[PDB]
Amino acid sequence: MNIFEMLRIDEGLRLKIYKDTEGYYTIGIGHLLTKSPSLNAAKSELDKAIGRNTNGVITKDEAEKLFNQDVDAAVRGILRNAKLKPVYDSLDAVRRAALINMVFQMGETGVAGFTNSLRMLQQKRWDEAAVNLAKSRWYNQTPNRAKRVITTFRTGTLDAYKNL
Numbered sequence: 001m002n003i004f005e006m007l008r009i010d011e012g013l014r015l016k017i018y019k020d021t022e023g024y025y026t027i028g029i030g031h032l033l034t035k036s037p038s039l040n041a042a043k044s045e046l047d048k049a050i051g052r053n054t055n056g057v058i059t060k061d062e063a064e065k066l067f068n069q070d071v072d073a074a075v076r077g078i079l080r081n082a083k084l085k086p087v088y089d090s091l092d093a094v095r096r097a098a099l100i101n102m103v104f105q106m107g108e109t110g111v112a113g114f115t116n117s118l119r120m121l122q123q124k125r126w127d128e129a130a131v132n133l134a135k136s137r138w139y140n141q142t143p144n145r146a147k148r149v150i151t152t153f154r155t156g157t158l159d160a161y162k163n164l
Contacts, residue, residue, distance in 0.1 A: 001158065003071065003097055003100070004029075004064055004067055005161075006097055006101070006158065006161055007029055007030070007067070007101065007104060008029065009145075009148070009161050009164055010101065010105075010145040010148070011029045011030035011104070011105075012029070012030075013028065013029055013060075013063060014026075014027055014028060014029075015027070015028065015057060015058050015059065015060065015063065016056060016057050016058075017033065017039075017042050017043065017046065017056040017057075020032070023037075025038075025039070025041075025042035027042075027046065027056075027058060027063070027066075028058060028062070028063030028066050028067065029063055029066070029067050029070065030070070030104070030105075031063075031066045031067070031070055033045045033046060039056075042056065043055065043056045046058070049066060050062050050065075050066075070104065071100065071104065074100050074103045074104045074108075075100060075103075077103060077107075077108030078099070078100070078103055078108070080108075081108055081112055083112045083115065083118055084099070084103070084108075084111065084112060084118070086122055087099065087118055087119075087121055087122040090121075090122045090124075091121070092156060094152060094156045094157060094158055095121075095152065095153055095156055097152075097158075098149045098150075098152045098153045101145075101149055102138075102149065105142070105145075106138065114132070114133070114136070116132040117129045117130075117132040117133050120132065121153065126153060126154050126155075126156075127154065129153060130150045130151075130153055130154045133146075133149075133150045133153070134147075134150065147160075148160040148161065148164065
């Protein structure tokens with residue numbers, strides 16, 4: 001029901017440094033720290049961020065704190081993008097987040113590739129934007145969350161996060 005708890009369902013929430021798929025040190029809600037194998041480099045960058053010898057463990061609060069900036073960096077990139085902005089503006093609240101989710105996960109540029117589906121959405125072509133979506137590298141990597149996003153675009157209700 002809220003931007004934070006929506007990405008919790010997807011990215012998941014970890015209050016201790018862990019490694020992503022490719023073995024990256026990250027914490028909280030998909031926040032990356034370092035790409036280097038250092039365990040002492042992640043904590044470091046963690047303290048720098050939190051601003052406190054956390055010893056690689058944070059509080060819920062600190063996560064949201066990192067979350068919001070992660071989220072602003074997502075929005076800021078959209079705002080400064082010729083292909084998403086328009087689309088973004090055109091969307092309702094419920095669909096603005098489905099939009100921010102992809103940029104949270106893929107990135108400003110990456111999401112700036114789906115011009116096929118980009119346009120249909122701006123045009124309110126839900127049922128059909130959903131289709132080009134399904135046929136995508138994205139859908140096949142994290143189909144779990146991807147098909148959740150697509151539904152919130154398809155409908156405009158955040159119901160997909162109401163069963164899971």
